[PDB]
Amino acid sequence: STGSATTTPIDSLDDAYITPVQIGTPAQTLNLDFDTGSSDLWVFSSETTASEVDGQTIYTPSKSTTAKLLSGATWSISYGDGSSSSGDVYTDTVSVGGLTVTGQAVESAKKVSSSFTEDSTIDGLLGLAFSTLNTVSPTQQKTFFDNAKASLDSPVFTADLGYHAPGTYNFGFIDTTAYTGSITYTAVSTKQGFWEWTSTGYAVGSGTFKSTSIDGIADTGTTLLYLPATVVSAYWAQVSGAKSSSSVGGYVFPCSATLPSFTFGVGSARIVIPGDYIDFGPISTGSSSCFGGIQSSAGIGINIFGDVALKAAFVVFNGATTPTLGFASK
C-alpha cells in the first residue's frame, strides 16, 4: 500500500504545516501537525477541557463505531518549545492520504497548554519519530508509520515541504518526479529516538564550504534551523545590522536586509536554503526588526534541522531495518 497527502502552511510565515487525517468511522477529518521529532498521535477531542478549545476541530470517540478505549492508558508530553498536553487513549482507524491503519492509538487530550489553544489551525500532532519516544503508559504505543510499515510497498515516508506553498507527505514510495538530481543517503542513529544524523558542514552565501560534523535531528515539527553558536554567528555576521537579542530571544535583523543563502552538507552533496527562507518577518506587527530563521542551539542540547532546512529538500525517512535519511534538491 501507499498514501499521499498534501501538507499546507498554517500561516504566511510557514510556522507549521497541517495535513488532513481521517479518524474513526464515519471519518472525522482533523488537520494534524506531522512531527518527525515526536512519537505521539494526539488530538483535540470531546474530552478536552472546554476553556482550552478555541476553534479547533475535535475528535469525538463516542461518534466513531470503531473507537475503543484503551483501558488504563494515559499520556503526557512536553515539547521543546515548552508546550504540553495530556489525556487518555483510544484505538481507532486512522487514514492518511488513502493509507489506512486499524487499531492506531489515538491519544485524546484532556488538557492542552496555552500555545495549542491559541493556535486554531492545529487540531493535534501526528508523531513520526521512533516509537521508543511514545509517552503512553503503562503500555507504550506505536506511531502511525510503525503500524503501517509492514503493509507499505517500501518502508519509507517522504517529506516535501513547500516554501509559502503546499507540499506533500508520501508513505510507502519515493516520487521520482518530486526532486532533481539524486537522493543522497546518510546514516541515522536511533539512540535518542530521533531521526538523528550528521551533516558534513556548511557555507554562508557564496562563501567557501566549511567541512565540519554537525550532529542533529530532522524535525518537521520545529519551525526553524537550530545550529551551534559558532555556525549561527558566522551566518549573521554576513547580514548588516543583525544581532542577537536576549529580549526578543534570538537573532534579529533589519527587515530591509537581503539575506544570504545557507548551505548544509549531506555526505558529499549540498542543500541550499535560499535567503528568503530564513526571513520570519517582523518581531511584532509593524516593526522593522525581523526574526531570523537560523538560531543557536546552545542550551537546547541538540541541533535541529527544522522546517527552514527541510523545506529546501525532498527528504526520505527510510524505516528499513537499519534506518537512514535521504536528501535531494528540488
From Swiss-Prot:
<keyword id="KW-0378">Hydrolase</keyword>
<feature type="domain" description="Peptidase A1">
    <location>
        <begin position="17"/>
        <end position="328"/>
    </location>
</feature>
<dbReference type="GO" id="GO:0004190">
    <property type="term" value="F:aspartic-type endopeptidase activity"/>
</dbReference>
<feature type="active site">
    <location>
        <position position="199"/>
    </location>
</feature>
<keyword id="KW-0064">Aspartyl protease</keyword>
<keyword id="KW-0645">Protease</keyword>
<comment type="similarity">
    <text>Belongs to the peptidase A1 family.</text>
</comment>
<keyword id="KW-0732">Signal</keyword>
<protein>
    <recommendedName>
        <fullName>Endothiapepsin</fullName>
        <ecNumber>3.4.23.22</ecNumber>
    </recommendedName>
</protein>
<dbReference type="GO" id="GO:0006508">
    <property type="term" value="P:proteolysis"/>
</dbReference>
<keyword id="KW-0865">Zymogen</keyword>
<keyword id="KW-1015">Disulfide bond</keyword>
<feature type="active site">
    <location>
        <position position="35"/>
    </location>
</feature>
<feature type="disulfide bond">
    <location>
        <begin position="255"/>
        <end position="290"/>
    </location>
</feature>
